[PDB]
Design an enzyme around this catalytic site. Structure first.
Site, PDB file in Angstrom:
ATOM      1  CG  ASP A 150      -2.110   0.876   1.052  1.00  0.00           C
ATOM      2  OD1 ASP A 150      -1.889   2.095   0.896  1.00  0.00           O
ATOM      3  OD2 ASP A 150      -3.253   0.364   1.083  1.00  0.00           O
ATOM      4  CG  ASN A 185     -23.775   4.517 -15.196  1.00  0.00           C
ATOM      5  OD1 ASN A 185     -24.635   4.053 -15.921  1.00  0.00           O
ATOM      6  ND2 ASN A 185     -24.058   5.316 -14.186  1.00  0.00           N
ATOM      7  CE1 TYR A 200     -13.650   5.905 -10.094  1.00  0.00           C
ATOM      8  CE2 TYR A 200     -15.984   6.319 -10.154  1.00  0.00           C
ATOM      9  CZ  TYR A 200     -14.917   5.542  -9.770  1.00  0.00           C
ATOM     10  OH  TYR A 200     -15.093   4.393  -9.037  1.00  0.00           O
ATOM     11  CE  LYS A 237     -10.928   2.418 -12.116  1.00  0.00           C
ATOM     12  NZ  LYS A 237     -10.103   2.567 -10.892  1.00  0.00           N
ATOM     13  CB  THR A 276     -15.066   0.828   1.742  1.00  0.00           C
ATOM     14  OG1 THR A 276     -15.459   1.922   0.905  1.00  0.00           O
ATOM     15  CG2 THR A 276     -15.248  -0.492   0.994  1.00  0.00           C
TER      16      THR A 276
HETATM   17  N1  LIG Z   1     -15.011   1.219  -2.879  1.00  0.00           N
HETATM   18  C1  LIG Z   1     -15.849   1.622  -3.821  1.00  0.00           C
HETATM   19  O1  LIG Z   1     -16.944   2.070  -3.547  1.00  0.00           O
HETATM   20  C2  LIG Z   1     -15.442   1.516  -5.256  1.00  0.00           C
HETATM   21  C3  LIG Z   1     -16.388   1.713  -6.237  1.00  0.00           C
HETATM   22  C4  LIG Z   1     -16.016   1.616  -7.558  1.00  0.00           C
HETATM   23  C5  LIG Z   1     -14.702   1.327  -7.851  1.00  0.00           C
HETATM   24  N2  LIG Z   1     -13.803   1.140  -6.895  1.00  0.00           N
HETATM   25  C6  LIG Z   1     -12.435   0.834  -7.301  1.00  0.00           C
HETATM   26  O2  LIG Z   1     -11.761   0.102  -6.282  1.00  0.00           O
HETATM   27  C7  LIG Z   1     -10.434   0.594  -6.108  1.00  0.00           C
HETATM   28  C8  LIG Z   1     -10.208   1.019  -4.668  1.00  0.00           C
HETATM   29  O3  LIG Z   1     -11.412   0.943  -3.909  1.00  0.00           O
HETATM   30  P1  LIG Z   1     -11.359   1.339  -2.360  1.00  0.00           P
HETATM   31  O4  LIG Z   1     -12.586   2.122  -1.999  1.00  0.00           O
HETATM   32  O5  LIG Z   1     -11.014   0.100  -1.584  1.00  0.00           O
HETATM   33  O6  LIG Z   1     -10.088   2.326  -2.459  1.00  0.00           O
HETATM   34  P2  LIG Z   1      -9.766   3.587  -1.512  1.00  0.00           P
HETATM   35  O7  LIG Z   1      -9.295   4.722  -2.375  1.00  0.00           O
HETATM   36  O8  LIG Z   1     -10.886   3.785  -0.535  1.00  0.00           O
HETATM   37  O9  LIG Z   1      -8.511   3.048  -0.679  1.00  0.00           O
HETATM   38  C9  LIG Z   1      -8.360   1.659  -0.418  1.00  0.00           C
HETATM   39  C10 LIG Z   1      -6.890   1.352  -0.196  1.00  0.00           C
HETATM   40  O10 LIG Z   1      -6.111   1.780  -1.314  1.00  0.00           O
HETATM   41  C11 LIG Z   1      -4.890   2.323  -0.816  1.00  0.00           C
HETATM   42  N3  LIG Z   1      -4.267   3.297  -1.742  1.00  0.00           N
HETATM   43  C12 LIG Z   1      -4.743   4.496  -2.094  1.00  0.00           C
HETATM   44  N4  LIG Z   1      -3.901   5.116  -2.952  1.00  0.00           N
HETATM   45  C13 LIG Z   1      -2.858   4.307  -3.159  1.00  0.00           C
HETATM   46  C14 LIG Z   1      -1.615   4.345  -3.948  1.00  0.00           C
HETATM   47  N5  LIG Z   1      -1.305   5.409  -4.716  1.00  0.00           N
HETATM   48  N6  LIG Z   1      -0.795   3.284  -3.879  1.00  0.00           N
HETATM   49  C15 LIG Z   1      -1.086   2.219  -3.124  1.00  0.00           C
HETATM   50  N7  LIG Z   1      -2.194   2.117  -2.382  1.00  0.00           N
HETATM   51  C16 LIG Z   1      -3.104   3.110  -2.357  1.00  0.00           C
HETATM   52  C17 LIG Z   1      -5.282   2.988   0.487  1.00  0.00           C
HETATM   53  O11 LIG Z   1      -4.191   3.080   1.398  1.00  0.00           O
HETATM   54  C18 LIG Z   1      -6.355   2.079   1.021  1.00  0.00           C
HETATM   55  O12 LIG Z   1      -5.802   1.152   1.951  1.00  0.00           O
HETATM   56  C19 LIG Z   1     -10.266   1.770  -7.039  1.00  0.00           C
HETATM   57  O13 LIG Z   1      -9.464   1.399  -8.151  1.00  0.00           O
HETATM   58  C20 LIG Z   1     -11.648   2.113  -7.515  1.00  0.00           C
HETATM   59  O14 LIG Z   1     -11.623   2.504  -8.888  1.00  0.00           O
HETATM   60  C21 LIG Z   1     -14.136   1.227  -5.611  1.00  0.00           C
END
Ligand SMILES: NC(=O)c1ccc[n+]([C@@H]2O[C@H](COP(=O)([O-])OP(=O)(O)OC[C@H]3O[C@@H](n4cnc5c(N)ncnc54)[C@H](O)[C@@H]3O)[C@@H](O)[C@H]2O)c1
Ligand SMILES: NC(=O)c1ccc[n+]([C@@H]2O[C@H](COP(=O)([O-])OP(=O)(O)OC[C@H]3O[C@@H](n4cnc5c(N)ncnc54)[C@H](O)[C@@H]3O)[C@@H](O)[C@H]2O)c1
Lengths: 245, 248
Positions: free
Chosen positions: A38, A147, A155, A159, A190
């Site tokens: 991370d 979407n 965003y 993606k 989350t």
């Molecule tokens: N959670 C959602 O609601 C959701 C919805 C659609 C898509 N996503 C996709 O899921 C992925 C992450 O979801 P999430 O909500 O768990 O992410 P988040 O951004 O809430 O963070 C989750 C984890 O990612 C780590 N992180 C953030 N930036 C980083 C970097 N530059 N290098 C390494 N680690 C990093 C953070 O430390 C954290 O532990 C994204 O790619 C996003 O496009 C998530």
């Protein structure tokens, strides 16, 4: 039963909490020596620490996927700690709403975080996976890549390239023995932007009637990187309750 | 008839030859006032000249889609000449086969060249189109954008991005009286392409194409005139695919 990762080494980027943290725990329970990773190296150490508690095999590392140097370190660290690389979950990334007149730094950054990162890592990981005889790359996309909506410039268009990257690079690394797939999640419990009146809205147009839980994606990652998805590649499995959020 | 651009102003990047030529060349005869633009400065001027020559209104100018200095220059330089902006044709773009292990410099550049820029110009003209009441933005994608094949990572994912951008920003400039479309073109038998094409390759490119001929630059322009004219006034967000029913 093919839903395992015996004798596997999995990098998971972005795995300190949420989906990353979930994919890490689930792969580690599946039997994979996980290189947890991370930007915040302490929670990354904790997730990897936690997996160790439960009898799992893991080391926790710092890696801003946007930092080329960090990528090459993680890649080198995995080999130096487990001997190989067979699975890479590009989960690190993110995004959100922005205006059409957004500043470009915000814009270009999204394609650094959400695309450039995971493509480069796939490049770094590929030849090693080949030597092991094959591997699997999982990109965590989004429902925004499909979407169509207001304030979705960065965003959305970022993606959607990760999807279509996943589709194509399968043709490139397929021959080396590698599957490339993508999970597009919906909204996940989350949370700072959530309130029960926005919830009923979000839950409108969501046939299954609930928001997501990170073991929902984690469960789908296990499948797509396990021999149960062995002839699957080039795909984008959308886990969003039959709807949009 | 609604297949016209009467008293419209069209900024048309990448327009010195081939497609972008025929776009700016066709929008001309459609009663449009064209800003013919390309990174060759003579190349744009030479084209605006033939347009003025055949009956039109067009000024030749220099822009590098991947240069902000050149972008802010094109908005104003068109406004200073025609008062308004009603059409933005982001035909400037590029890409092609690239091995998987390509240098990240190449990968980023195709996004710089195909996405970032387009997006930026279209940020620019969007409030100036809003003054004129409304207008049409058009991007040029490529069947790389939906199709999937080997060595297509940089070329393919970028045009893909272009596409879904078209699909989403149309919700943004959609209330501003602007519509966003895109065209994924198949293989266009241009002068550039002809000089490295051959009949034995062409026969390969064409089998698995139902119509049975290559595209030609006008075919994209006909679609570009329709998509920008009122004859598509309630059409937006679209990615029209002019490729003869097949991939090449
Ligand atoms: N959670 C959602 O609601 C959701 C919805 C659609 C898509 N996503 C996709 O899921 C992925 C992450 O979801 P999430 O909500 O768990 O992410 P988040 O951004 O809430 O963070 C989750 C984890 O990612 C780590 N992180 C953030 N930036 C980083 C970097 N530059 N290098 C390494 N680690 C990093 C953070 O430390 C954290 O532990 C994204 O790619 C996003 O496009 C998530
Ligand atoms: N076979 C085809 O021609 C074909 C097929 C599908 C899509 N396209 C799309 O059409 C567009 C270009 O058409 P083309 O194939 O004739 O390209 P091209 O390179 O043959 O010429 C297009 C014009 O763009 C100009 N140009 C190059 N770089 C520029 C920059 N940075 N700024 C401004 N102008 C620049 C060039 O001078 C050239 O005159 C691209 O978006 C491409 O993806 C073309």
């Amino acid at each position: 039963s093919p839903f395992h990762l015996n004798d596997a080494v999995a990098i998971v980027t972005g795995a300190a909490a949420g989906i990353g943290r979930a994919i890490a725990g689930t792969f580690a329970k599946a039997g994979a020596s996980v290189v947890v990773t991370d930007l915040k190296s302490e929670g990354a150490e904790a997730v990897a620490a936690a997996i160790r508690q439960a009898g799992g095999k893991a080391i926790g590392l710092e890696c801003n996927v946007t930092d080329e140097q960090h990528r090459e370190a993680v890649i080198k660290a995995a080999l130096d700690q487990f001997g190989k690389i067979t699975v890479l979950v590009n989960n690190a990334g993110g995004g959100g709403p922005k205006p059409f007149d957004m500043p470009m730094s915000d814009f270009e950054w999204a394609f650094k975080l959400n695309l450039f990162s995971l493509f480069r890592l796939s490049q770094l990981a590929a030849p090693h996976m080949q030597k092991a005889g094959g591997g699997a790359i999982l990109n965590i996309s989004s429902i925004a890549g499909e979407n169509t909506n207001v304030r979705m410039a960065s965003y959305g268009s970022s993606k959607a390239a990760v999807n279509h990257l996943t589709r194509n690079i399968a043709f490139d690394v397929g021959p080396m023995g590698i599957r490339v797939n993508a999970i597009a999640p919906g909204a996940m419990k989350t949370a700072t932007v959530l309130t029960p009146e926005i919830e009923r809205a979000m839950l409108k147009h969501t046939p299954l009637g609930r928001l997501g839980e990170a073991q929902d994606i984690a469960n789908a990652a296990l499948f797509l990187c396990s021999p149960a998805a062995a002839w699957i590649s080039g795909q984008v499995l959308t886990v969003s309750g039959g709807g949009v959020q």
